[PDB]
Design an enzyme around this catalytic site. Structure first.
Site, PDB file in Angstrom:
ATOM      1  N   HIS A  29      -7.710  -4.336  50.723  1.00 24.20           N
ATOM      2  CA  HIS A  29      -6.526  -3.495  50.515  1.00 24.20           C
ATOM      3  C   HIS A  29      -5.955  -3.054  51.903  1.00 24.20           C
ATOM      4  N   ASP A  88     -11.520  -9.716  37.808  1.00 22.27           N
ATOM      5  CA  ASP A  88     -10.348  -9.161  37.140  1.00 22.27           C
ATOM      6  C   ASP A  88      -8.987  -9.768  37.680  1.00 22.27           C
ATOM      7  N   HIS A  89      -9.088 -10.839  38.456  1.00 20.88           N
ATOM      8  CA  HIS A  89      -7.894 -11.604  38.919  1.00 20.88           C
ATOM      9  C   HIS A  89      -8.450 -12.817  39.658  1.00 20.88           C
ATOM     10  N   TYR A 119      -2.183  -7.652  34.883  1.00 15.45           N
ATOM     11  CA  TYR A 119      -2.846  -6.885  33.857  1.00 15.45           C
ATOM     12  C   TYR A 119      -1.930  -6.754  32.644  1.00 15.45           C
ATOM     13  N   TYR A 145     -11.883 -22.188  26.734  1.00 22.40           N
ATOM     14  CA  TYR A 145     -13.367 -22.159  26.744  1.00 22.40           C
ATOM     15  C   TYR A 145     -14.040 -21.190  27.703  1.00 22.40           C
TER      16      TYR A 145
HETATM   17  C1  HEC Z   1      -6.430  -8.806  50.977  1.00 22.53           C
HETATM   18  C2  HEC Z   1      -6.613  -8.385  52.428  1.00 22.53           C
HETATM   19  C3  HEC Z   1      -5.283  -9.736  50.545  1.00 22.53           C
HETATM   20  C4  HEC Z   1      -4.818 -10.925  51.124  1.00 22.53           C
HETATM   21  C5  HEC Z   1      -5.351 -11.675  52.365  1.00 22.53           C
HETATM   22  C6  HEC Z   1      -3.771 -11.346  50.276  1.00 22.53           C
HETATM   23  N1  HEC Z   1      -3.511 -10.461  49.287  1.00 22.53           N
HETATM   24 FE1  HEC Z   1      -2.009 -10.481  47.862  1.00 22.53          FE
HETATM   25  N2  HEC Z   1      -2.510  -8.589  47.247  1.00 22.53           N
HETATM   26  C7  HEC Z   1      -3.616  -7.937  47.601  1.00 22.53           C
HETATM   27  C8  HEC Z   1      -3.731  -6.719  46.900  1.00 22.53           C
HETATM   28  C9  HEC Z   1      -4.861  -5.673  46.962  1.00 22.53           C
HETATM   29  C10 HEC Z   1      -2.608  -6.671  46.076  1.00 22.53           C
HETATM   30  C11 HEC Z   1      -2.265  -5.537  45.120  1.00 22.53           C
HETATM   31  C12 HEC Z   1      -1.750  -4.371  45.961  1.00 22.53           C
HETATM   32  C13 HEC Z   1      -1.472  -3.209  45.038  1.00 22.53           C
HETATM   33  O1  HEC Z   1      -0.275  -2.802  44.877  1.00 22.53           O
HETATM   34  O2  HEC Z   1      -2.466  -2.698  44.466  1.00 22.53           O
HETATM   35  C14 HEC Z   1      -1.873  -7.840  46.341  1.00 22.53           C
HETATM   36  C15 HEC Z   1      -0.632  -8.172  45.659  1.00 22.53           C
HETATM   37  C16 HEC Z   1      -0.105  -9.499  45.643  1.00 22.53           C
HETATM   38  C17 HEC Z   1       0.956  -9.920  44.822  1.00 22.53           C
HETATM   39  C18 HEC Z   1       1.687  -9.078  43.801  1.00 22.53           C
HETATM   40  C19 HEC Z   1       0.705  -8.822  42.627  1.00 22.53           C
HETATM   41  C20 HEC Z   1       1.330  -8.369  41.309  1.00 22.53           C
HETATM   42  O3  HEC Z   1       2.596  -8.072  41.212  1.00 22.53           O
HETATM   43  O4  HEC Z   1       0.511  -8.288  40.359  1.00 22.53           O
HETATM   44  C21 HEC Z   1       1.151 -11.233  45.151  1.00 22.53           C
HETATM   45  C22 HEC Z   1       2.167 -12.246  44.593  1.00 22.53           C
HETATM   46  C23 HEC Z   1       0.236 -11.551  46.158  1.00 22.53           C
HETATM   47  N3  HEC Z   1      -0.520 -10.505  46.470  1.00 22.53           N
HETATM   48  C24 HEC Z   1       0.152 -12.884  46.754  1.00 22.53           C
HETATM   49  C25 HEC Z   1      -0.720 -13.156  47.855  1.00 22.53           C
HETATM   50  C26 HEC Z   1      -0.732 -14.454  48.426  1.00 22.53           C
HETATM   51  C27 HEC Z   1       0.105 -15.651  47.970  1.00 22.53           C
HETATM   52  C28 HEC Z   1      -1.642 -14.383  49.447  1.00 22.53           C
HETATM   53  C29 HEC Z   1      -2.043 -15.484  50.433  1.00 22.53           C
HETATM   54  C30 HEC Z   1      -0.755 -16.021  51.082  1.00 22.53           C
HETATM   55  C31 HEC Z   1      -2.121 -13.044  49.447  1.00 22.53           C
HETATM   56  N4  HEC Z   1      -1.514 -12.306  48.474  1.00 22.53           N
HETATM   57  C32 HEC Z   1      -3.062 -12.592  50.448  1.00 22.53           C
HETATM   58  C33 HEC Z   1      -4.589  -8.359  48.555  1.00 22.53           C
HETATM   59  C34 HEC Z   1      -4.468  -9.505  49.420  1.00 22.53           C
HETATM   60  C1  ISW Z   2     -10.195 -26.226  22.055  1.00 18.91           C
HETATM   61  C2  ISW Z   2     -10.124 -25.614  20.660  1.00 18.91           C
HETATM   62  C3  ISW Z   2     -10.764 -27.595  22.116  1.00 18.91           C
HETATM   63  C4  ISW Z   2     -10.808 -28.615  21.053  1.00 18.91           C
HETATM   64  C5  ISW Z   2     -10.216 -28.668  19.654  1.00 18.91           C
HETATM   65  C6  ISW Z   2     -11.538 -29.709  21.758  1.00 18.91           C
HETATM   66  N1  ISW Z   2     -11.800 -29.359  23.008  1.00 18.91           N
HETATM   67 FE1  ISW Z   2     -12.830 -30.528  24.446  1.00 18.91          FE
HETATM   68  N2  ISW Z   2     -13.902 -31.646  25.834  1.00 18.91           N
HETATM   69  C7  ISW Z   2     -14.945 -32.471  25.534  1.00 18.91           C
HETATM   70  C8  ISW Z   2     -15.558 -32.556  24.163  1.00 18.91           C
HETATM   71  C9  ISW Z   2     -14.811 -32.385  22.910  1.00 18.91           C
HETATM   72  C10 ISW Z   2     -15.141 -33.057  21.618  1.00 18.91           C
HETATM   73  C11 ISW Z   2     -16.321 -33.981  21.344  1.00 18.91           C
HETATM   74  C12 ISW Z   2     -15.873 -35.455  21.439  1.00 18.91           C
HETATM   75  C13 ISW Z   2     -15.360 -36.030  20.109  1.00 18.91           C
HETATM   76  O1  ISW Z   2     -15.441 -35.354  19.050  1.00 18.91           O
HETATM   77  O2  ISW Z   2     -14.850 -37.171  20.073  1.00 18.91           O
HETATM   78  C14 ISW Z   2     -14.029 -32.611  20.723  1.00 18.91           C
HETATM   79  C15 ISW Z   2     -13.768 -32.931  19.262  1.00 18.91           C
HETATM   80  C16 ISW Z   2     -13.191 -31.724  21.602  1.00 18.91           C
HETATM   81  N3  ISW Z   2     -13.670 -31.658  22.869  1.00 18.91           N
HETATM   82  C17 ISW Z   2     -11.915 -31.017  21.220  1.00 18.91           C
HETATM   83  C18 ISW Z   2     -15.360 -33.224  26.742  1.00 18.91           C
HETATM   84  C19 ISW Z   2     -16.435 -34.213  26.898  1.00 18.91           C
HETATM   85  C20 ISW Z   2     -17.792 -33.546  27.080  1.00 18.91           C
HETATM   86  C21 ISW Z   2     -18.714 -34.713  27.436  1.00 18.91           C
HETATM   87  O3  ISW Z   2     -19.182 -34.858  28.602  1.00 18.91           O
HETATM   88  O4  ISW Z   2     -18.984 -35.545  26.537  1.00 18.91           O
HETATM   89  C22 ISW Z   2     -14.499 -32.695  27.822  1.00 18.91           C
HETATM   90  C23 ISW Z   2     -14.480 -33.098  29.282  1.00 18.91           C
HETATM   91  C24 ISW Z   2     -13.669 -31.695  27.141  1.00 18.91           C
HETATM   92  C25 ISW Z   2     -12.575 -30.922  27.780  1.00 18.91           C
HETATM   93  C26 ISW Z   2     -11.944 -29.703  27.310  1.00 18.91           C
HETATM   94  C27 ISW Z   2     -11.047 -28.886  28.120  1.00 18.91           C
HETATM   95  C28 ISW Z   2     -10.730 -29.118  29.592  1.00 18.91           C
HETATM   96  C29 ISW Z   2     -10.901 -27.738  30.272  1.00 18.91           C
HETATM   97  C30 ISW Z   2     -10.687 -27.808  27.176  1.00 18.91           C
HETATM   98  C31 ISW Z   2      -9.808 -26.620  27.410  1.00 18.91           C
HETATM   99  C32 ISW Z   2     -11.411 -28.151  25.905  1.00 18.91           C
HETATM  100  N4  ISW Z   2     -12.039 -29.323  26.040  1.00 18.91           N
HETATM  101  C33 ISW Z   2     -11.281 -27.309  24.636  1.00 18.91           C
HETATM  102  C34 ISW Z   2     -11.697 -27.872  23.252  1.00 18.91           C
HETATM  103  C1  ISW Z   3     -12.688  -0.696  43.949  1.00 22.33           C
HETATM  104  C2  ISW Z   3     -13.050   0.714  43.631  1.00 22.33           C
HETATM  105  C3  ISW Z   3     -11.195  -0.949  43.997  1.00 22.33           C
HETATM  106  C4  ISW Z   3     -10.057  -0.019  44.132  1.00 22.33           C
HETATM  107  C5  ISW Z   3      -9.974   1.464  44.349  1.00 22.33           C
HETATM  108  C6  ISW Z   3      -8.912  -0.932  43.982  1.00 22.33           C
HETATM  109  N1  ISW Z   3      -9.334  -2.183  43.865  1.00 22.33           N
HETATM  110 FE1  ISW Z   3      -8.120  -3.925  43.815  1.00 22.33          FE
HETATM  111  N2  ISW Z   3      -6.943  -5.653  43.712  1.00 22.33           N
HETATM  112  C7  ISW Z   3      -5.800  -5.715  42.994  1.00 22.33           C
HETATM  113  C8  ISW Z   3      -5.391  -4.595  42.040  1.00 22.33           C
HETATM  114  C9  ISW Z   3      -5.532  -3.138  42.323  1.00 22.33           C
HETATM  115  C10 ISW Z   3      -4.594  -2.014  41.959  1.00 22.33           C
HETATM  116  C11 ISW Z   3      -3.325  -2.126  41.099  1.00 22.33           C
HETATM  117  C12 ISW Z   3      -2.080  -2.172  41.992  1.00 22.33           C
HETATM  118  C13 ISW Z   3      -1.451  -0.813  42.338  1.00 22.33           C
HETATM  119  O1  ISW Z   3      -1.829   0.234  41.749  1.00 22.33           O
HETATM  120  O2  ISW Z   3      -0.542  -0.753  43.199  1.00 22.33           O
HETATM  121  C14 ISW Z   3      -5.256  -0.794  42.588  1.00 22.33           C
HETATM  122  C15 ISW Z   3      -4.874   0.666  42.584  1.00 22.33           C
HETATM  123  C16 ISW Z   3      -6.483  -1.369  43.207  1.00 22.33           C
HETATM  124  N3  ISW Z   3      -6.591  -2.721  43.029  1.00 22.33           N
HETATM  125  C17 ISW Z   3      -7.477  -0.606  44.025  1.00 22.33           C
HETATM  126  C18 ISW Z   3      -5.069  -6.999  43.322  1.00 22.33           C
HETATM  127  C19 ISW Z   3      -3.771  -7.427  42.720  1.00 22.33           C
HETATM  128  C20 ISW Z   3      -4.058  -8.049  41.349  1.00 22.33           C
HETATM  129  C21 ISW Z   3      -2.748  -8.676  41.001  1.00 22.33           C
HETATM  130  O3  ISW Z   3      -2.706  -9.896  40.854  1.00 22.33           O
HETATM  131  O4  ISW Z   3      -1.749  -7.961  40.902  1.00 22.33           O
HETATM  132  C22 ISW Z   3      -5.955  -7.713  44.266  1.00 22.33           C
HETATM  133  C23 ISW Z   3      -5.847  -9.045  44.967  1.00 22.33           C
HETATM  134  C24 ISW Z   3      -7.072  -6.776  44.418  1.00 22.33           C
HETATM  135  C25 ISW Z   3      -8.203  -7.042  45.322  1.00 22.33           C
HETATM  136  C26 ISW Z   3      -9.513  -6.331  45.272  1.00 22.33           C
HETATM  137  C27 ISW Z   3     -10.698  -6.807  45.965  1.00 22.33           C
HETATM  138  C28 ISW Z   3     -10.882  -8.068  46.752  1.00 22.33           C
HETATM  139  C29 ISW Z   3     -12.141  -8.744  46.181  1.00 22.33           C
HETATM  140  C30 ISW Z   3     -11.679  -5.728  45.659  1.00 22.33           C
HETATM  141  C31 ISW Z   3     -13.124  -5.678  46.091  1.00 22.33           C
HETATM  142  C32 ISW Z   3     -10.952  -4.729  44.772  1.00 22.33           C
HETATM  143  N4  ISW Z   3      -9.685  -5.136  44.595  1.00 22.33           N
HETATM  144  C33 ISW Z   3     -11.634  -3.481  44.239  1.00 22.33           C
HETATM  145  C34 ISW Z   3     -10.796  -2.339  43.663  1.00 22.33           C
END
Ligand code: HEC
Ligand code: ISW
Ligand code: ISW
Ligand code: HEC
Ligand code: HEC
Ligand code: HEC
Ligand code: HEC
Ligand code: HEC
Ligand code: HEC
Lengths: 49, 502, 502, 502, 49, 49
Positions: free
Chosen positions: B233, B267-268, B334, B467
């Protein structure tokens, strides 16, 4: 600051967006009595607005 | 003015963009940047916590003092010579870097893909001249230890025990005004329609403020655990998390790895979902074929780049690249944040969706890109729904007072946190049956598994919303919540039968 | 004199470093190395388990016999001729190795960063002259299939059914006496101040002994499962796990990926925490800019290496690099092992802490390194406190006789294991309610989650001790333990009342 | 004749391999390929689901119609010109492809390791002559937008709103008859001796059919979740999942990353297990050293490759390589499938084992490979046993109707599914106590944890069948099943007592 | 062979290394009554022997 | 189609394939009374055929 709409209602709303109010769609989320709940577009577009 | 900075920034800084100078713009940006009102300092819970030793590098504006030793009065050449022994790789990384090689940049010819760097050098000289840091015909000779760590373009001696600073974003921005202003402009562009998040948030401009305004962060005793949060942050404070010290390589900041240390985990999981997608795997397979030295705007032509990367998608807006990463944000990670899902069909969200579509259609057709983003939005909402159902059950027990130990062993969280159901606090602090297990199971369902399902969807990793992350784990949470709800009912029933017999 | 081999190894061996010849050093080392009392053979539980087919490769000195076919009698040239067909890659890999190209090495110029190999060649040759394997006037022509797999510098035919061996560490040390001696010196340098672990452990010198001295490994019926453990534990017996057969590339063994097959996973996620740190992220991004062929002593200067790696941190000690990886060890991965936390402030640890500072300060200032290392120590203690609280609860239950099925369905573990609480065996063997769920939970909270927490701290991956590994998962364990605790109390209080009424 | 296509495929198609022309072979393959009775179309449960927007790309033959806009008519060059602006990177990628540079291939000399490609070009042309898409004296000029998306070798205008198609496997196989034939031959080679799986499965030829003939995928209402399954199951329909559009690089499809998006995750973690084995880590370390452009048959000679990759292991059969990946399958990932374990010692399995051994002996001795393959088979059965034991317990509960909510809160799955115990549908659908927690847990034990254990064993990642996946996770599931069962038996006894008391 | 010390005591010790024995610090681990536990330094300084 | 045979019987078969019918071998999967269950090869080669 917005009225809460549950995710199922948002989904039903979106499912209906291209549709007439008398069209019936499948729910994206609900199953009842071994079947996907159907929803009537008019009833849901009413629930949102 | 700065051609890539938004009007809403000039407005917020009370500046007229047709007349502002670099000096003026810088000074206004910094005045906002250093103001506690606008997020500098210890924040509103400053009385609850104290810095640890590392905190001096995390927030140098609040905490940094130079060390008491060595006592050395030093000129530019001395920094380099002594540190050649004290921190040798810092010197060598520095020597290799553009900052230490500005005449190379001066000599770049117009058929070199890196040519734009000369323009950027000349822009930096313009900024410093406007600021009185550089003579109007005086070339900037280097950016050296003394420049970043004492004073830009410093002529004379520095006192080690008094003049050394840790360079913060305003220090880099003295020369890189454009990128600093672009970054700061997130405060003005990231404004939600219904205040879904605070204005300027989520953004890199306010990441530090966000962290220190998190109650559990301020309240918990385990300072060293808390400072792990702080290390993800610090963008607000320092400019080297993407292009790291001391090479400061732009090529490095363009690689997906540069974002991964912060944008990963429970959570992200952007790093995990992106690297597993076909996009990410093509970037892994072709990393050695692309020229990462070209600027983003040239990545797909001169860079030979043929799959998208975090920077290319997130720094792109309406055809230009800037350090503002907030302008296409719709979901914000979220999905369960109140008003986010309701906002998804607004004109405001549609507008941002169109900007996304424009990004994708650098390669895909618009019909394909809109097909996928439709899947992303509805799959997100399908996850949200399943969690919402599970949460109704647990929240019901809470209001009933019937969670395990709710009325017998549920101590209050540390100050200033207030007791509540399934709050953020319960992920970093637990004691007794606060939180209850079901309660934690449902919080994680949303915070971890639903958020990961969304990230899987946004970054095109099928296994990451079906899955392996998202739907699979949410299904188990649902199932386990239902099971224990019922187990808990049948035991309640049986307890009832027993005080009847009594 | 091998000047990189500690005094305590020549003392342990009863040699004078000034006088001992390479032959005498090699034989003393090999005497200890092959001695059952010192860890060789089937170890103290050898009566409980038999080798499987793969065991002939894992512990050749105990188990290997050459195959009954091909019935063949081959000269040096015939090995290469026939295997070109039979195991074609082995020939190809070998042919492109230094082993196969010793003249290339003899021709290095002294201004080449690889000139040191030419000193190493001549050192080998000197060793072999002392052992009587090479003429005073003879150069070593090559290191070929017949040399490693039958006898060094063999001059005549070999019988394929009788004379073929698997080259073990002693086989390699015939020539590579220095590296062999450095690695064997872990036996003598890894001595804890209060027996925290057995003398010489943890180390690569005794990894296989440690494996076969683990009760559950020796006792469990699933041999093929146990042999997965053996696969991470073969350094003691064979030298090809970091620089693999048949290229034997020192460049490969410097890369973080060489350590990752073994030092990864739920109870020591080193690969995961390091690769997600800024450090390991930068190593991914720069792997193609570094010269991996230069020796570790030169990586930061001549290799242009600007971020640290596994081998560069753990092989370095007080400015030198050796195959002994034990000398700076303080926490040894598992922070709950009795005496480890309380030894963390001793003089002994603090001197090791000083050696680590030396390592970090090739790059960072001392103030920065010590600030961080302080956070690693204290963050690990905070983790430890949290598990300790949890274990109090579950341990109380075990002693109270109250775990699930504890009195009614807890069969004893396979021989020669003894029944206990929260014992390593319960991770690889379970039957009825041995262990109970709460017992496995808390055992895993320490063995897995607290251990990964500490690894995340040590390897600078903030999410790896906060959200994703470490604190997050330990928080969940504690919450579920407390929850299951309160539930089980309500249930025994309820069946007190059914009892009263009866 | 097509020398790499199995006899059984000519048999299945009632063709005479000595006689059939390319045109005839193509036409027979496509007739089967497009036939509902053979898997084409919406499949048997087509009445239960409808396509979403992205399905037009996932199953084009069933769903795809050209866009209504733009309403333009175009010749070959106009595709390129307009798209050069509307989808710029597709034009850049295509221009970089072999497809756009056929004269290069034509000018290949016989000392070029890529020389094989000119034979392939001539084979393509001869295929097109046989189909009369190409004059018997005409050279193929290019493979451009109009060819794939309209009609091969199209000489005139196309109506954008009428003539545009998404290229499916049959489109590619117009030119690449061999690959398409080798692929389609999986239908004819993957036949189980006891029908353990349906004929032709598992395979790439029937992956889509397999997806749409899965009850839960057809029945569930979360279409966007289900379509992430479809994303991993599109090979049957389109040929760009390994060598992606628009580059179509064979070099790319040869890298392990090509397979990872699909072959990863919680129930088949091949990417994870392979990348962490020595094989994968060597492939990571050495990727920069191999010439990935050479054909697989030349990988180990001309390519320099010295560690194995997915494509090299799985496309290889008796010293040849084809697009058929099914000829050595024994375990097929899920060890619990009825008849799979029982079949492991069959003559059919043993011939397939012999085929593997041959693959491995590219590098290892036969003895070594046989040693390790035995450990894989046996380790697999030991995990299977552990699962079978846990299943007996929960499965008993089911027969006794004693699972939580079983008689009280177990609603039926969505049509056309039938209620049952531990069925695949309970991984993607849940409501009330359908499934119960113990039920899901023993289900995931087999589906996730046992499968991953086998993957780890087959892919030589020791942590992936011991500590981190397979055994440890199975251990936990067994322990928690036993523990819940005991608690449930105790609560059942406590209840019995309370009736009796009334 | 070392006398066992809990990690909460190791930490309080650590924070009290360089204090007067009447100086008071926060716990790194303990929350009681809605507040981080305060530690008088002399006391945990005495707990180590 | 195949008569189902449990995984532990498959292991025991494999551990006996080369044995005389009177030879005893260790289970690969079973522990009773603190000890690996022993199996007579005649009993298992019997169960399978
Ligand atoms: C930690 C030091 C971060 C790095 C490096 C990057 N991001 Fe980030 N990003 C970070 C936080 C903690 C947050 C939320 C801040 C807050 O308000 O709580 C964000 C936010 C974004 C968002 C917007 C998220 C939203 O609207 O939900 C974006 C699109 C985003 N960040 C993109 C982003 C990208 C592309 C990064 C690499 C280029 C990147 N961030 C680096 C924390 C950190
Ligand atoms: C979600 C509701 C999905 C359905 C209806 C479905 N998939 Fe999948 N998946 C593999 C295996 C199978 C099989 C068994 C083979 C058969 O019946 O002929 C069915 C019916 C099925 N899926 C349907 C395999 C192979 C595993 C192996 O090593 O044999 C995959 C690779 C595979 C991929 C996959 C993805 C990719 C992320 C997702 C989202 C799902 N499946 C979900 C699931
Ligand atoms: C642990 C106690 C932490 C605090 C106090 C905290 N984080 Fe985080 N985190 C994201 C989301 C948020 C937000 C919501 C945004 C806002 O209020 O302005 C707060 C207040 C917060 N964190 C504080 C995001 C953005 C998610 C998104 O897509 O929008 C992150 C990226 C993010 C990073 C992050 C890390 C890095 C691993 C950790 C350890 C925490 N958070 C813990 C947490
Ligand atoms: C003037 C005294 C500067 C200060 C203070 C900082 N930088 Fe700089 N940097 C400067 C110039 C004139 C240039 C060359 C023109 C250009 O932009 O390329 C640079 C170069 C960079 C780069 C790119 C290097 C490369 O990849 O070729 C980056 C990433 C960069 N600078 C970042 C940076 C940061 C983060 C600073 C604060 C620590 C910083 N610079 C200070 C001039 C000046
Ligand atoms: C385009 C092909 C992308 C690439 C490459 C990466 N991301 Fe992304 N991201 C993308 C989309 C379409 C979305 C959802 C947009 C929406 O809100 O509707 C996201 C989301 C994020 C966010 C949240 C902010 C937001 O815009 O909603 C973050 C913080 C984020 N992504 C980070 C990120 C990182 C770190 C990447 C590299 C590992 C990355 N993204 C790749 C599109 C694309
Ligand atoms: C990983 C834990 C290793 C094991 C196990 C062994 N070696 Fe090693 N080796 C390793 C590294 C990281 C290096 C580079 C060392 C450096 O300072 O650069 C080496 C190097 C050697 C060499 C030197 C070859 C050369 O540089 O030209 C030899 C001769 C060597 N190693 C032999 C050796 C033997 C005999 C081992 C078993 C006792 C052995 N090594 C194990 C990493 C690892
Ligand atoms: C060359 C292209 C190979 C093929 C084909 C196979 N393997 Fe391999 N394997 C190879 C190398 C270069 C290595 C590393 C050697 C080392 O020093 O560790 C290996 C490693 C193994 C191992 C582990 C051996 C160990 O000492 O820990 C096993 C068990 C193994 N390989 C098995 C194996 C099997 C069963 C194969 C066919 C399915 C196979 N390998 C193919 C090179 C090559
Ligand atoms: C010392 C530098 C070696 C030379 C020269 C050669 N081999 Fe080797 N080989 C070596 C080791 C360390 C091992 C592993 C020992 C163990 O216990 O695992 C091996 C093993 C083999 C094997 C069997 C295992 C396998 O992976 O196949 C074979 C078939 C083998 N080696 C063949 C071989 C050939 C043909 C060589 C000359 C071209 C050759 N080896 C050289 C060490 C050394
Ligand atoms: C032609 C026939 C030869 C000759 C001239 C040599 N070898 Fe090698 N070898 C050969 C075969 C056919 C096999 C396979 C045996 C099996 O796996 O069942 C081998 C095996 C080896 C091995 C591996 C031994 C093992 O796995 O236990 C080694 C290390 C080996 N052979 C070495 C070797 C040497 C040193 C030779 C010259 C002295 C040599 N071989 C000649 C076939 C042939």
């Amino acid at each position: 600051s917005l009225a809460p709409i549950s995710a199922k209602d948002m989904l039903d709303y979106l499912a209906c967006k291209d549709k007439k109010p008398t069209d019936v769609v499948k729910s994206h989320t609900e199953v009842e009595n071994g079947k996907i709940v159907r929803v009537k577009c008019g009833d849901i577009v009413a629930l949102v607005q | 003015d700065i051609s890539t900075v938004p009007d809403e920034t000039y407005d917020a800084l009370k500046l007229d963009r047709g007349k502002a100078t670099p000096k003026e713009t810088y000074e206004a940006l910094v005045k906002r940047y250093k103001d506690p009102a606008h997020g500098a300092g210890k924040g509103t819970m400053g009385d609850y916590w104290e810095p640890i030793a590392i905190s001096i590098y995390m927030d140098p504006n609040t905490f940094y003092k130079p060390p008491v030793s060595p006592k050395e009065v030093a000129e530019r050449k001395d920094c380099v010579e002594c540190h050649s022994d004290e921190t040798p790789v810092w010197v060598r990384a520095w020597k290799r870097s553009t900052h230490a090689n500005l005449d190379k940049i001066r000599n770049l010819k117009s058929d070199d893909p890196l040519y734009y760097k000369k323009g950027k050098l000349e822009e930096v000289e313009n900024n410093l001249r406007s600021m009185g840091k550089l003579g109007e015909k005086e070339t900037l000779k280097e950016v050296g230890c003394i420049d970043c760590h004492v004073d830009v373009n410093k002529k004379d001696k520095a006192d080690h025990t008094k003049d050394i600073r840790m360079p913060t974003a305003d220090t880099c921005g003295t020369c890189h005004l454009r990128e600093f202003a672009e970054r700061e402009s997130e405060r003005d562009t990231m404004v939600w329609p219904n205040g879904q998040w605070p204005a300027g948030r989520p953004s890199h401009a306010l990441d530090y403020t966000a962290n220190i305004e998190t109650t559990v962060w301020a309240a918990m005793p385990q300072r060293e655990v808390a400072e792990g949060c702080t290390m993800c942050h610090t963008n607000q404070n320092k400019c080297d998390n993407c292009h790291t010290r001391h090479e400061f390589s732009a090529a490095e900041s363009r690689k997906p790895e540069a974002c991964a240390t912060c944008h990963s985990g429970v959570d992200h999981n952007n790093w995990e979902a992106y690297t597993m997608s076909k996009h990410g795997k093509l970037a892994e397979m072709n990393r050695d074929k692309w020229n990462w030295e070209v600027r983003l705007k040239d990545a797909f032509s001169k860079g030979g780049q043929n799959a998208p990367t975090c920077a290319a998608c997130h720094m792109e807006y309406e055809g230009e690249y800037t350090h503002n990463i907030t302008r296409k944000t719709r979901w914000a990670n979220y999905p369960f944040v109140p008003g986010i899902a309701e906002n998804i069909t607004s004109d405001w969200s549609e507008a941002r969706l169109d900007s996304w579509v424009l990004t994708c259609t650098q390669c895909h057709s618009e019909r394909f890109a809109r097909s996928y983003l439709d899947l992303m939005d509805k799959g997100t909402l399908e996850g949200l729904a399943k969690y919402q159902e599970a949460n109704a059950i647990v929240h019901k027990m809470y209001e009933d007072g019937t969670l395990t130990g709710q009325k017998t062993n549920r101590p209050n969280p540390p100050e200033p946190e207030k007791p509540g159901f399934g709050i953020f606090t319960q992920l970093f602090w637990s004691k007794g049956n606060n939180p209850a297990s079901l309660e934690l199971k449902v919080l994680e369902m949303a915070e971890n598994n639903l958020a990961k399902m969304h990230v899987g969807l946004a970054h095109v990793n099928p296994g990451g919303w079906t899955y392996t992350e998202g739907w699979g784990p949410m299904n188990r949470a649902y199932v386990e919540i239902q099971d224990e709800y019922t187990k808990m009912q049948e035991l309640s029933a049986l307890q009832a039968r027993v005080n009847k017999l009594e």
